């Protein structure tokens, strides 16, 4: 009956930050507030002020001293809050968790409050390539706490404490409409055409759940289909100033099925995205990591019904492609959008330079 | 009668590095060896090895977490040495300073030796601009000491100690030849020409010593000279893969002297480079700093008689320009090379991207 | 290294409706990765508690877990008459996962005197060259008992499970010796 809490101490041991959670679920309309408590000894500083900062950054490069193009660190959101000396009571009152932490600690505890705006991306990370070293570009969240006489004062390693949090999303309860698509291709003069119908079973598939596609081919024409290919593609939409869409296949299934002219074909396939065979592909997007733990493929990013903003950070989306191989060109294909989420538990110069550099790298 | 020594302790206090000097003078044929002593308690690690690394890097960006294009960190020279457990006796024996440090410390001291190659640049630093933040690109030297089971092991903040050294050059004793230049400009059909002669007093000027130029103008022509301009230019030759020459004026003197046709003129000017009026110019090169101290203008970089290498890092050179203002074009100018030194005391992708970025910035 | 999961007591006796408490000790600190399984004799284990505090779906509410530093505890409020099995303690935070040593829970009754019987070897067994002496203990309590042989090793004892008819235990001890050694005394 005792809840857990996460804490991290300063290298000198004087400063410690208490956090009630590490994953802050987004509800598509509001974000769970970042409520915490900072413990500091007044006799230690006795003239400075305690500041806590929330930051989300589009970081590149590794964590330590890389020996190449280092961390382009465009910032998407910066917040500042003062713990000791205290500030006005809002917002709005102190929370229940803050009250319990104050009761557990005493007078030497000072709370802080942060409200994450809705217009922010989720924590993801591009998969590094074998030729590269360390990690690659990926947004992340961070909380810092330090003692200084002003906000512009330089950072101190002996007093500041750095903590890493995450922003996650979960599967909505309401099911979506049935995803289906069709595509017809006629010929030069004959009314004979090439009609195919493809559809999924659901909009939302949990991580690891197989995908069953329903493909119907109406080849009432003269040409012959040799191969059928079903692929699941991942779209990583890097957005800083100019949108860049990157395609990375994650699962492919091929069968040597022949479709005779003036005949139909029906079959149901089974394709499942997973990380075992995509451990060497550049440009793959994974879920944000805490320190170094293994993470699955990046969950789809779903936005509100009225799309006005959130063009920032990295956006992930999945689409299933079904392709028909036709002799002498005439390829016909369809794309079936779907989401992939976990179930709910119970004009700066160097910025343009970096954008061009990333575009040249991944493309 | 007691010599001083410099030391720095690890954050935990277990590791300490003793260095006999911080400025290593280059003698145009050899570099003063980096001899030092590392103090470590065997009981602390008792399974790892002590490593000391010498590194020179073409670093960009600030020291802390910049919020823009961060430290491009191309490395020019990397060396590795093991202190404890020990290595063979060379090279060649241990030195006298190492012996004295061992006598002062005892068994818990382990020496290390480094030989800086001749083909290395001197420590300089480009002056930051008002629009930019922190510092700019500039080579520097560094010594690190850490305990690990292998060279590929990740760095540890609690054990590693970072120290900064410098490589400097001083004025040679042998004077150079008298620097002088001439330039003649004739006209369309008349034999009348424009002859000027300019010369300095010495090749080498100490930092702050005024420069006296001897200008002789033989305007045995019909045109009239309105203004005379004397300028001292600084050339910063950034060399990573493609040489880039950058011009930054540092001192200018103008006089409203009129030269009559078919007459001569003689005068001696006085121009002195200094940092007071060049505190806002981008692309200025200064001497390498230890931590944050103020430094003068970057000293000239002199190489050996047989030029085969040293095309690395940043190279600084000075030239005095004397310009004659002539009506309707026909400008005539000369350049007088000279050195400026202190007296002797008693195809990687992102590399190309960064080179283009720097070229676009400074030009 | 490997995290040893010391689980005590090895075996406890309790009556119907009483309270049963089992403690699990971890040599190294695991945050909450502790699971409690119940294994009836002859069947496969069944998960009861995960994350050291959560009740598995389809499990009676009498089972409950708790955490205190590195001390994990399983508590049963009302001991049902069918909850007499073996319980294990498993940690899954560091590979490899390590299980406990088990905690057998049996019904409690009064102490019954053992009906000690001594069986001499048969003539056919003696003619075979190997002689065995069978000592019988029937309808005693508890399971633990002391047996001695004298006319030493070369003795093996087999104990049966607690029969619900009498809630007691039966033990059979066999002392096997060679024909010459048997004929010595």
């Amino acid at each position: 009956p005792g809840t857990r809490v996460f804490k991290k101490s300063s290298p000198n041991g004087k400063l410690t930050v208490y956090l009630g959670k590490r994953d802050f679920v987004d509800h598509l309309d509001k974000v769970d507030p970042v409520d915490g408590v900072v413990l500091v000894d007044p006799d230690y500083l006795k003239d400075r002020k305690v500041f806590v900062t929330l930051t989300v950054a589009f970081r590149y490069g590794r964590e330590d001293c890389d020996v190449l193009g280092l961390s382009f660190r465009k910032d998407l959101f910066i917040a500042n809050y003062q713990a000791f000396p205290p500030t006005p009571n809002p917002p709005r009152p102190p929370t229940r968790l803050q009250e319990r932490l104050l009761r557990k600690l005493g007078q030497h505890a000072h709370p802080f409050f942060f409200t994450i705006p809705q217009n922010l991306p989720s924590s993801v990370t591009l998969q590094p390539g074998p030729e590269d070293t360390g990690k690659a570009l990926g947004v992340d969240f961070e909380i810092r706490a330090f003692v200084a006489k002003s906000l512009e004062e330089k950072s101190h390693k002996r007093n500041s404490v750095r903590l890493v949090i995450r922003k996650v999303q979960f599967a909505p309860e309401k099911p979506g409409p049935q995803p289906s698509a069709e595509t017809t291709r006629h010929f030069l003069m004959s009314d004979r055409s090439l009609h195919l119908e493809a559809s999924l079973d659901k909009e939302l598939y949990y991580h690891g759940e197989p995908l069953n596609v329903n493909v119907h081919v109406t080849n009432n024409s003269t040409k012959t289909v040799k191969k059928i290919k079903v692929s699941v593609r991942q779209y990583a939409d890097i957005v800083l100033f100019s949108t860049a869409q990157y395609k990375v296949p994650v699962a492919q299934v091929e069968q040597d099925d022949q479709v005779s002219p003036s005949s139909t074909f029906s079959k149901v396939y089974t394709i499942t995205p997973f990380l075992a065979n995509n451990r060497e592909k550049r440009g793959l997007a994974l879920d944000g990591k805490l320190k170094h733990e293994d993470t699955n493929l990046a969950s789809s990013t779903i936005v509100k019904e009225g799309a006005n903003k959130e063009v920032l950070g990295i956006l992930v989306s999945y689409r299933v492609k079904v392709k028909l191989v036709v002799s002498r060109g005439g390829d016909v294909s369809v794309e079936l959008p779907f989401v992939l989420m976990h179930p709910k538990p119970h004009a700066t110069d160097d910025d343009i330079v970096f954008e061009d550099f990333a575009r040249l790298r991944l493309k | 009668p007691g010599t001083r020594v410099f030391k720095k302790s690890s954050p935990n206090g277990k590791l300490t590095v003793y260095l006999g000097k911080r400025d290593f003078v280059d003698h145009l044929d050899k570099v003063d060896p980096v001899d030092g002593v590392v103090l470590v308690d065997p009981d602390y690690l008792k399974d790892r090895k002590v490593f000391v690394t010498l590194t020179v890097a073409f670093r960009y960006g600030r020291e802390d977490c910049d919020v823009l294009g961060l430290s491009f960190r191309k490395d020019l020279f990397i060396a590795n040495y093991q202190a404890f457990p020990p290595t063979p006796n060379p090279p060649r024996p241990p030195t006298r300073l190492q012996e004295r440090l061992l006598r002062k410390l005892g068994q818990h001291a382990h020496p290390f030796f480094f030989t800086i190659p001749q083909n290395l640049p001197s420590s300089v630093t480009l002056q930051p601009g008002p629009e930019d933040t922190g510092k700019a690109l500039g080579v520097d030297f560094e010594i690190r000491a850490f305990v690990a089971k292998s060279l590929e092991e990740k760095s540890h903040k609690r054990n590693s100690v970072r120290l900064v050294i410098r490589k400097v050059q001083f004025a040679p004793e042998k004077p150079g030849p008298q620097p002088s230049a001439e330039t003649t400009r004739h006209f369309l059909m008349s034999d009348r020409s424009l002859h000027l002669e300019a010369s300095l007093d010495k090749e080498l000027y100490y930092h702050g010593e005024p420069l006296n130029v001897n200008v002789h103008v033989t305007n045995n022509s019909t045109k009239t000279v309105k203004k005379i301009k004397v300028s001292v230019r600084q050339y910063a030759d950034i060399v990573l893969f493609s040489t880039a020459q950058y011009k930054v004026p540092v001192a200018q003197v103008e006089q409203d002297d009129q030269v009559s046709p078919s007459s001569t003129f003689s005068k001696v000017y006085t121009i002195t480079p200094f940092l007071a009026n060049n505190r806002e110019k981008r692309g200025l090169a200064l001497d390498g700093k230890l931590k944050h101290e103020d430094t003068n203008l970057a000293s000239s970089t002199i190489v050996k008689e047989g030029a085969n290498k040293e095309v690395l890092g940043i190279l600084v050179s000075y030239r005095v320009k004397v310009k004659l203002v002539v009506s309707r074009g026909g400008d005539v100018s000369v350049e007088l090379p000279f050195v400026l030194m202190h007296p002797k005391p008693h195809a990687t992708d992102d590399d190309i991207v960064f080179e283009d970025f720097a070229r676009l910035r400074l030009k | 290294s490997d995290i040893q999961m010391t689980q005590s007591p090895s075996s406890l006796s309790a009556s119907v409706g009483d309270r049963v408490t089992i403690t699990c000790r971890a040599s190294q600190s695991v945050s909450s990765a502790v699971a409690w399984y119940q294994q009836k004799p002859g069947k496969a284990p069944k998960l009861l508690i995960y994350s050291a505090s959560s009740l598995y779906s389809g499990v009676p509410s009498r089972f409950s877990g708790s955490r205190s530093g590195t001390d994990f505890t399983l508590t049963i409020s009302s001991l049902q008459p069918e909850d007499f099995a073996t319980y294990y303690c498993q940690q899954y935070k560091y590979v490899p996962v390590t299980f406990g040593q088990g905690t057998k829970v049996e019904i409690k009754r009064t102490v019954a005197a053992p009906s000690v019987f001594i069986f001499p070897p048969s003539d056919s067994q003696l003619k075979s060259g190997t002689a065995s002496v069978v000592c019988l203990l029937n309808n005693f309590y508890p399971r633990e008992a002391k047996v001695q042989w004298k006319v030493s090793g070369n003795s093996q004892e087999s104990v049966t499970e607690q029969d619900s008819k009498d809630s007691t235990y039966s033990l059979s001890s066999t002392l096997t010796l060679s024909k010459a050694d048997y004929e010595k005394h």
């Binding site: 009956p1 005792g2 809840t3 857990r4 809490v5 996460f6 804490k7 991290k8 101490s9 290298p11 319990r100 932490l101 557990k104 903590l163 | 540890h156 903040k157 609690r158 | 945050s31 955490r67």
Partner: peptide
């Protein structure tokens, strides 16, 4: 090891 992020138990 190093300076990791340990935990603690919160109660009423």
């Amino acid at each position: 090891l190093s300076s990791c992020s340990e935990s603690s138990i919160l109660t009423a």
